[PDB]
Amino acid sequence: FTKVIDEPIKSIMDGIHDGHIKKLLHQYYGDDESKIPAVEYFGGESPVEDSAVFKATSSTDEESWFKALAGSEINWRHASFLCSFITQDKMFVSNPIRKVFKPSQGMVVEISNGNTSSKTVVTLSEPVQG
Amino acid sequence: PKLIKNKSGKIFVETKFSKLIGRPPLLVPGMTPCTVSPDFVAATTNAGYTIELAGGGYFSAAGMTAAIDSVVSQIEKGSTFGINLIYVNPFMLQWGIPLIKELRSKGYPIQFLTIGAGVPSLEVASEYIETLGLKYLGLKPG
């Protein structure tokens, strides 16, 4: 298959990807892109309620806590509470949202307008001065 | 395998590897001397396809660091690439694995480490997985 010379890597890989996409669309979607599911962003998925109030305890499981805070629908909240790394100026560092929202006794997280991603607000409260 | 799309409308082949990496399930493996070039690695990453900077053309941590810095300068913001190392030469590992750990400590976009020409033992693989703090570990069994 190595015939055409000086074809850019972009062109070669895009050709392979569009070939796979076209064949998959023809076979298991019926040549209809509307049948393709849509998500806000695609990536970061490991191979392995409008108004909600969550409480963190000593024995609470951190992964379940972060999954609950992220929610089911894929959005900025999902990325904030499940993406392991954030992008610095050009560098990759741990997720400050996850580090801040790490569960512990006394933390109460109130998620308002969870259904609407645009208006969703997550408020974490801790015991301060009692 | 399935198909998925994002807000921009780009059609992705939803498959386990693609879901993990947030990119199409096609990658350019570490190739000495082909992927040695920082320009080619940066070009593939800008194209949006996984690629491994092969260490075979680098014999020193300083040289590989210069190449990685060149790749980082050439790629766009938020981009990522892997590093490929050969297991048959212990010198390669001795100068590369500490370098990968140091660059990941600095926060470099080293998405993964691929090990070719041999599968590391359980202890060595565990040490890589724990210390390097990579997104995933590639292994090329024979």
Coordinates of C-alpha atoms in Angstrom, one line a residue:
Chain A
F1 CA 0.0 0.0 0.0
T2 CA 3.1 2.3 0.0
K3 CA 2.8 3.8 -3.5
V4 CA 2.2 7.6 -3.6
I5 CA 5.2 9.6 -2.6
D6 CA 5.3 12.7 -0.4
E7 CA 1.7 12.3 0.7
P8 CA 1.4 14.2 4.1
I9 CA 0.8 12.1 7.2
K10 CA -2.3 14.2 7.7
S11 CA -3.6 13.1 4.3
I12 CA -2.7 9.4 4.8
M13 CA -4.2 9.1 8.3
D14 CA -7.3 11.1 7.4
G15 CA -7.8 8.9 4.3
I16 CA -7.6 5.8 6.5
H17 CA -9.9 7.3 9.1
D18 CA -12.5 8.4 6.6
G19 CA -12.4 5.0 4.9
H20 CA -13.2 3.4 8.2
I21 CA -15.9 5.9 9.0
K22 CA -17.5 5.5 5.6
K23 CA -17.5 1.7 5.8
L24 CA -18.9 1.7 9.4
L25 CA -21.6 4.2 8.3
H26 CA -22.6 2.1 5.4
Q27 CA -22.7 -1.1 7.3
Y28 CA -23.9 -0.4 10.9
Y29 CA -25.6 3.0 10.4
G30 CA -27.0 2.9 6.9
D31 CA -25.2 5.9 5.4
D32 CA -26.7 8.4 7.8
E33 CA -24.5 10.6 10.0
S34 CA -27.6 11.6 12.1
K35 CA -27.5 8.1 13.6
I36 CA -24.1 8.8 15.1
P37 CA -24.3 9.6 18.8
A38 CA -23.0 13.0 19.8
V39 CA -21.1 14.0 22.9
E40 CA -19.7 17.4 24.0
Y41 CA -16.2 16.0 24.0
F42 CA -14.8 12.6 23.0
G43 CA -11.9 11.2 25.1
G44 CA -10.6 10.5 28.6
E45 CA -12.8 7.5 29.2
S46 CA -10.8 4.7 30.9
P47 CA -11.1 1.2 29.3
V48 CA -12.1 -0.2 32.7
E49 CA -31.0 15.0 39.2
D50 CA -31.3 18.7 38.5
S51 CA -30.7 19.6 42.2
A52 CA -28.5 17.3 44.1
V53 CA -26.7 17.3 47.5
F54 CA -23.8 15.0 48.1
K55 CA -21.9 14.5 51.4
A56 CA -18.4 13.2 51.7
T57 CA -17.5 10.9 54.7
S58 CA -14.3 9.2 55.8
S59 CA -15.3 5.9 54.2
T60 CA -16.8 7.4 51.0
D61 CA -15.2 6.0 47.8
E62 CA -13.4 8.6 45.9
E63 CA -14.1 7.2 42.4
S64 CA -17.8 6.9 43.1
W65 CA -17.8 10.4 44.6
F66 CA -16.2 11.9 41.5
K67 CA -18.5 9.9 39.2
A68 CA -21.5 11.3 41.1
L69 CA -20.2 14.9 41.0
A70 CA -19.5 14.5 37.2
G71 CA -22.9 13.1 36.4
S72 CA -24.1 11.0 33.5
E73 CA -24.2 13.6 30.7
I74 CA -20.9 14.5 29.1
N75 CA -20.1 18.2 29.6
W76 CA -17.6 20.6 31.2
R77 CA -18.7 19.2 34.6
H78 CA -17.9 15.7 33.4
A79 CA -14.4 16.8 32.3
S80 CA -13.8 18.8 35.5
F81 CA -14.6 15.9 37.8
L82 CA -13.2 13.0 35.8
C83 CA -10.4 14.4 33.6
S84 CA -7.2 13.4 35.4
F85 CA -5.0 16.2 33.9
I86 CA -5.5 19.8 32.8
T87 CA -3.5 21.7 30.2
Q88 CA -1.1 24.4 31.4
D89 CA 0.4 26.9 29.0
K90 CA 1.8 23.9 27.1
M91 CA 2.2 21.4 30.0
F92 CA 0.1 18.7 31.7
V93 CA -0.6 18.8 35.4
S94 CA -3.0 17.1 37.8
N95 CA -6.6 18.3 37.9
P96 CA -7.0 21.1 40.5
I97 CA -10.8 20.6 40.5
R98 CA -10.3 17.0 41.5
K99 CA -7.7 17.9 44.1
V100 CA -9.9 20.5 45.6
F101 CA -13.1 18.3 45.5
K102 CA -11.2 15.3 47.0
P103 CA -13.8 13.9 49.4
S104 CA -13.3 14.2 53.2
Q105 CA -15.5 14.3 56.2
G106 CA -17.7 17.5 56.4
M107 CA -17.7 18.4 52.7
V108 CA -21.2 19.1 51.2
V109 CA -21.5 19.6 47.5
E110 CA -24.7 21.2 46.1
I111 CA -25.2 20.9 42.3
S112 CA -27.9 23.1 40.9
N113 CA -29.3 23.0 37.4
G114 CA -27.4 19.8 36.7
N115 CA -29.5 19.0 33.7
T116 CA -28.6 22.3 32.0
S117 CA -24.8 22.4 31.5
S118 CA -24.8 26.1 30.7
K119 CA -26.5 27.0 34.0
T120 CA -25.0 24.2 36.1
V121 CA -23.4 25.4 39.4
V122 CA -21.5 23.2 41.9
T123 CA -21.0 24.7 45.4
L124 CA -18.7 22.9 47.8
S125 CA -19.1 23.9 51.5
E126 CA -16.9 22.8 54.5
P127 CA -17.1 23.6 58.2
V128 CA -15.5 27.0 58.7
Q129 CA -15.5 28.4 62.3
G130 CA -17.9 25.7 63.3
Chain B
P1 CA -16.5 -0.6 16.8
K2 CA -18.9 2.4 16.5
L3 CA -19.0 6.0 15.4
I4 CA -19.3 9.1 17.5
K5 CA -19.1 12.8 17.0
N6 CA -18.3 16.0 19.0
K7 CA -19.8 19.5 18.9
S8 CA -17.5 20.4 16.0
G9 CA -18.9 17.5 14.0
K10 CA -15.7 15.6 13.6
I11 CA -16.5 11.9 13.2
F12 CA -14.4 9.6 15.4
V13 CA -14.3 5.8 15.3
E14 CA -15.5 5.1 18.8
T15 CA -13.3 2.2 19.9
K16 CA -11.7 1.4 23.3
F17 CA -8.3 2.9 22.4
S18 CA -9.9 5.9 20.8
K19 CA -12.2 6.5 23.8
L20 CA -9.2 6.4 26.1
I21 CA -6.9 8.7 24.0
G22 CA -9.6 11.1 22.7
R23 CA -8.3 10.6 19.1
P24 CA -8.8 8.2 16.2
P25 CA -7.7 4.6 16.8
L26 CA -4.6 4.9 14.5
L27 CA -1.1 5.5 15.7
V28 CA 2.4 5.9 14.2
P29 CA 4.6 3.6 16.2
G30 CA 8.1 4.5 17.3
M31 CA 10.4 4.1 14.3
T32 CA 14.2 4.5 14.2
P33 CA 15.1 6.8 12.4
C34 CA 11.6 7.9 11.0
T35 CA 9.9 9.0 14.2
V36 CA 13.2 10.2 15.6
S37 CA 12.7 13.5 13.7
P38 CA 10.9 16.0 16.0
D39 CA 9.4 17.5 12.9
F40 CA 7.6 14.3 11.9
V41 CA 6.3 13.7 15.4
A42 CA 5.0 17.2 15.7
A43 CA 3.4 17.0 12.3
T44 CA 1.6 13.8 13.1
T45 CA 0.4 15.2 16.5
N46 CA -0.8 18.3 14.7
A47 CA -2.6 16.1 12.2
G48 CA -4.3 14.6 15.3
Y49 CA -3.0 11.0 15.4
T50 CA -1.0 9.3 18.1
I51 CA 2.8 9.1 17.5
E52 CA 5.8 7.8 19.4
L53 CA 9.1 9.7 19.5
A54 CA 11.6 6.9 19.1
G55 CA 14.6 7.1 21.3
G56 CA 16.7 5.0 19.0
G57 CA 18.2 8.0 17.3
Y58 CA 19.0 9.6 20.7
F59 CA 21.9 8.3 22.8
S60 CA 21.7 10.8 25.6
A61 CA 19.1 12.3 28.0
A62 CA 20.2 15.8 26.8
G63 CA 19.6 14.9 23.2
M64 CA 16.2 13.3 23.9
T65 CA 15.2 16.3 26.0
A66 CA 16.1 18.7 23.2
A67 CA 14.0 16.7 20.8
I68 CA 11.1 16.6 23.2
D69 CA 11.3 20.4 23.7
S70 CA 11.4 20.8 19.9
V71 CA 8.3 18.6 19.6
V72 CA 6.5 20.6 22.4
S73 CA 7.3 23.9 20.7
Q74 CA 6.1 22.6 17.3
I75 CA 2.8 21.1 18.5
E76 CA -0.3 23.1 19.5
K77 CA -1.6 23.7 22.9
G78 CA -3.0 20.7 24.7
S79 CA -1.4 18.3 22.2
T80 CA 0.3 15.0 23.3
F81 CA 2.7 12.4 22.0
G82 CA 4.3 9.2 23.3
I83 CA 7.9 8.0 23.7
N84 CA 9.2 4.7 22.4
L85 CA 12.1 2.8 24.0
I86 CA 13.9 -0.5 23.1
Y87 CA 14.2 -3.0 25.9
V88 CA 17.2 -4.9 24.5
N89 CA 19.7 -2.2 25.5
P90 CA 19.8 -1.5 29.3
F91 CA 21.7 1.7 28.7
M92 CA 18.7 3.1 26.8
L93 CA 16.4 2.3 29.6
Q94 CA 18.7 3.6 32.3
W95 CA 19.0 7.1 30.7
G96 CA 15.4 7.2 29.4
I97 CA 13.2 6.0 32.2
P98 CA 14.5 8.6 34.7
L99 CA 14.2 11.2 31.9
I100 CA 10.6 10.3 31.4
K101 CA 9.9 10.5 35.1
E102 CA 11.6 13.9 35.3
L103 CA 9.7 15.3 32.3
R104 CA 6.4 14.0 33.7
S105 CA 7.3 15.6 37.0
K106 CA 7.7 18.9 35.1
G107 CA 4.4 18.1 33.4
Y108 CA 5.5 17.3 29.9
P109 CA 2.9 16.0 27.4
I110 CA 4.2 12.4 27.4
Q111 CA 0.9 10.6 27.0
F112 CA 2.5 7.1 27.1
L113 CA 5.7 5.1 27.0
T114 CA 5.9 2.2 24.5
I115 CA 8.4 -0.6 25.1
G116 CA 9.5 -2.5 22.0
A117 CA 11.8 -5.5 21.4
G118 CA 10.8 -7.1 24.7
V119 CA 8.2 -7.1 27.4
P120 CA 9.5 -5.8 30.8
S121 CA 9.3 -8.1 33.8
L122 CA 6.4 -7.6 36.3
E123 CA 8.6 -5.5 38.7
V124 CA 10.0 -3.3 35.9
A125 CA 6.5 -2.7 34.4
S126 CA 5.1 -1.9 37.8
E127 CA 7.9 0.6 38.4
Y128 CA 7.2 2.3 35.1
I129 CA 3.4 2.4 35.7
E130 CA 3.8 3.8 39.2
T131 CA 6.7 6.2 38.8
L132 CA 6.2 7.6 35.4
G133 CA 2.6 8.5 35.9
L134 CA 1.7 8.1 32.3
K135 CA -1.8 7.8 30.8
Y136 CA -1.2 4.3 29.5
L137 CA 1.7 1.9 28.9
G138 CA 2.3 0.4 25.5
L139 CA 4.0 -3.0 25.1
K140 CA 5.0 -4.7 21.9
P141 CA 4.9 -8.5 22.7
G142 CA 6.4 -10.8 20.1

